[PDB]
Amino acid sequence: PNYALKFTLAGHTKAVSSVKFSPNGEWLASSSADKLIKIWGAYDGKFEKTISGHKLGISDVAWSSDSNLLVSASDDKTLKIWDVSSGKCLKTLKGHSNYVFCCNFNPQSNLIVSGSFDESVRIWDVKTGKCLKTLPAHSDPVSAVHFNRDGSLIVSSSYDGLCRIWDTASGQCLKTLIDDDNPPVSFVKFSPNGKYILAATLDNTLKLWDYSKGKCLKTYTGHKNEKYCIFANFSVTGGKWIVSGSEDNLVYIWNLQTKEIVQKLQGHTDVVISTACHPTENIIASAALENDKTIKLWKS
Amino acid sequence: GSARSEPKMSKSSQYRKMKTEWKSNVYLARSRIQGLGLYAARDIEKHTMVIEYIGTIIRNEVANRKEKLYESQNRGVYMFRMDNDHVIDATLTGGPARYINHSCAPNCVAEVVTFERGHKIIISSSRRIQKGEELCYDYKFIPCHCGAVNCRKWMN
Amino acid sequence: RVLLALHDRAPQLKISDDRLTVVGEKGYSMVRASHGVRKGAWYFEITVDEMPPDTAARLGWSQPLGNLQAPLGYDKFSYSWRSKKGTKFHQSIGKHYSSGYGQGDVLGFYINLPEDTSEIIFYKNGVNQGVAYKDIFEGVYFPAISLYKSCTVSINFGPCFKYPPKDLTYRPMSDM
Ligand SMILES: [Zn+2]
């Protein structure tokens, strides 16, 4: 465990919100809220092209199989259906009335969910884009949408710790999960099997929650997450690894069985908004907000 | 522009006739004000009774710890007072009526008919409420998301 | 005569018809006495007669502008000490003091109150339980009782006390 700095991805006008790697080692664009998506690289920061022309800042952008097809979850209550080599507004998604926080293409590449805050969540079509359903996704605003390994389950996060695994074919979720905290959950996600969900309970104790029982496996220590948005990552390249984001200008990389403090990596100048992981190689990015305006690549 | 970069900072008998049809009255339907609400697969007529506010009776003082309970799991945002003596909870175990919302044109009011087991919050009608109209009550103690005609866009 | 009060009650509380005994209500609401002082070292007695298994009842001095419905120890007006696991309370927070009281004792309470020319001590079978806190506020100091299921405790104000200690110079409240 000697993960060393390799590159630096600067050149931002506003704060960077997210990094999300390509599924097979292709790209990592500037998924920020700066009205800019510059197609940066994952291996060496290879600048490809400029895809911009937005009205407001993008909360997060989606991703595709070829890491090209996008849809903008911007803050102007609209969504364009994007392509890299087009630069053209195909259609417009309408049905929100607040911040479009999050949107996803499923791993089968045939759905466009779009998360909202006043529960105007609509699951859209990739081809047509017709108004289908308002969803009562929580009692609270949504802070995560995700699709599992195959694409029949939708996890969603709340401001009181609702791990609702929404069904794709029917629309009725199965199991309600809870903690004794009152957690404003910034992010939940699936696993490579869909059974363990890492929520956000904000007293420096983030828990990996089971599918059926709703218990936790191993409650980690030594991390800093009480107010700010921090993603949730795992690594399958070599052995067991735990990678997350930080707040105190560090890079959080640990192991699952230990629950210790064995590696933290200085090098940032802001609260780490985002880290991410790569399946075959230990190529790890680490993004931060406006007081850094860089995305620093890491590699063993 | 980002919210992610910003940190998160005669009456009794007809009433029991209504008591014998609680599955038959409504089903748990939605409302696009916020999440759910309550619609009907029927036309609720004039002087038709609907629901009773039941659940877990708080004593005189236990609300002063229930307000601390509201800071753990954010449990009850569904309040309605019984009286000066007591309050009724509907969050741990009790009445499932915790999805009756409010728009600033409420189509129901609160009325009290008293049994031997104490004062009970009783709902009736005064008009023929049609199919699918959301039942919602005036509060009289966060802005609304309804889009109503001549709407105050508040709670009370 | 040093006795109880009329409207110092909740309707679920039953001040008994002897004005020497309070009957417990199964919840937790505060009943208080009627004759108190403001400055000086004074004394009375609560004779705890009978107790069920696994109870919770808190006794101590109080001021009348507190909560009429609280378990005792909820406010800064008053202190308390619980019959189970022996805990002193400041706004009803668990701060471990001793082990609580049982069946067949007298809980006769001492007060200390200086002034420019203040602590609350609890007794139990004459045992000096120690000091709860120091430098309490200004007001009229009533006793206060909140109980379990309908048990039996007695109050006492006469100079023929059951357990008179010999460690402090105190006065009975019946001199009023
Ligand atoms: Zn309205």
Curated annotation (Swiss-Prot), chain A:
Function, as annotated, reads: Contributes to histone modification. May position the N-terminus of histone H3 for efficient trimethylation at 'Lys-4'. As part of the MLL1/MLL complex it is involved in methylation and dimethylation at 'Lys-4' of histone H3. H3 'Lys-4' methylation represents a specific tag for epigenetic transcriptional activation. As part of the NSL complex it may be involved in acetylation of nucleosomal histone H4 on several lysine residues. May regulate osteoblasts differentiation.
Give the species.
Answer: Homo sapiens (Human)
Q: What happens after mutating residue 101 to A?
A: Strongly reduced affinity for histone H3. Significant decrease in interaction with KMT2A
Q: Mutating residue 290 to A: effect?
A: Strongly reduced affinity for histone H3. No effect on interaction with KMT2A
Sorted UniProt keywords: Acetylation, Chromatin regulator, Host-virus interaction, Isopeptide bond, Nucleus, Repeat, Transcription, Transcription regulation, Ubl conjugation, WD repeat
Q: What is the effect of changing residue 231 to A?
A: Strongly reduced affinity for histone H3. Significant decrease in interaction with KMT2A
* Impact upon substituting residue 289 to A: Abolishes histone H3 binding
The consequence of residue 117 to A is: Significant decrease in interaction with KMT2A
Cite the InterPro entries for this sequence. Answer: G-protein_beta_WD-40_rep, WD40/YVTN_repeat-like_dom_sf, WD40_repeat_CS, WD40_repeat_dom_sf, WD40_rpt
What is the protein name for this chain?
WD repeat-containing protein 5
Positions carrying N6-acetyllysine: 80
Chief subcellular location equals nucleus
Residues annotated as site: Important for interaction with histone H3 = 75, 101, 231, 290
Swiss-Prot record, chain B:
Q: What is this protein called?
A: Histone-lysine N-methyltransferase 2C
Q: Which residues bind S-adenosyl-L-methionine?
A: 78, 101-102
Q: Where is the Post-SET domain?
A: 142-156
Describe its function.
Answer: Histone methyltransferase that catalyzes methyl group transfer from S-adenosyl-L-methionine to the epsilon-amino group of 'Lys-4' of histone H3 (H3K4). Part of chromatin remodeling machinery predominantly forms H3K4me1 methylation marks at active chromatin sites where transcription and DNA repair take place. Likely plays a redundant role with KMT2D in enriching H3K4me1 mark on primed and active enhancer elements.
Q: Which residues of the full protein are shown?
A: 4707 to 4911 of 4911
What's this protein's family per the entry? Answer: Belongs to the class V-like SAM-binding methyltransferase superfamily. Histone-lysine methyltransferase family. TRX/MLL subfamily.
Oligomeric state and interaction partners are given as: Component of the MLL3 complex (also named ASCOM complex), at least composed of catalytic subunit KMT2C/MLL3, ASH2L, RBBP5, WDR5, NCOA6, DPY30, KDM6A, PAXIP1/PTIP, PAGR1 and alpha- and beta-tubulin. Forms a core complex with the evolutionary conserved subcomplex WRAD composed of WDR5, RBBP5, ASH2L/ASH2 and DPY30 subunits; WRAD differentially stimulates the methyltransferase activity. Interacts (via WIN motif) with WDR5.
The associated disease is: Kleefstra syndrome 2: A form of Kleefstra syndrome, an autosomal dominant disease characterized by variable intellectual disability, psychomotor developmental delay, seizures, behavioral abnormalities, and facial dysmorphisms.
Which residue ranges does the UniProt annotation give for the motif WDR5 interaction motif (WIN)? 1-6
Q: Which organism is it from?
A: Homo sapiens
Which stretches make up the SET domain?
A: 24-140
Swiss-Prot record, chain C:
| Annotated function | Transcriptional regulator. Component or associated component of some histone methyltransferase complexes which regulates transcription through recruitment of those complexes to gene promoters. Component of the Set1/Ash2 histone methyltransferase (HMT) complex, a complex that specifically methylates 'Lys-4' of histone H3, but not if the neighboring 'Lys-9' residue is already methylated. As part of the MLL1/MLL complex it is involved in methylation and dimethylation at 'Lys-4' of histone H3. May play a role in hematopoiesis.
- Highest taxon, organism lineage: Eukaryota
Modifications the protein undergoes after translation, according to the UniProt entry: Both monomethylated and dimethylated on arginine residues in the C-terminus. Methylation is not required for nuclear localization, nor for MLL complex integrity or maintenance of global histone H3K4me3 levels.
Q: Where is the B30.2/SPRY domain?
A: 1-162
Extent of the signal sequence: none
Indicate where this protein resides in the cell. Nucleus
Organism, by scientific name, is: Homo sapiens
Which stretch of the full-length chain is present here? Answer: 380 to 597 of 628
| Disulfide linkage | none
User: Which protein are we looking at?
Assistant: Set1/Ash2 histone methyltransferase complex subunit ASH2
Assembly notes? Interacts with HCFC1. Core component of several methyltransferase-containing complexes including MLL1/MLL, MLL2/3 (also named ASCOM complex) and MLL4/WBP7.
Membrane-spanning residues: none
Q: How is expression of this protein distributed across tissues?
A: Ubiquitously expressed. Predominantly expressed in adult heart and testis and fetal lung and liver, with barely detectable expression in adult lung, liver, kidney, prostate, and peripheral leukocytes.
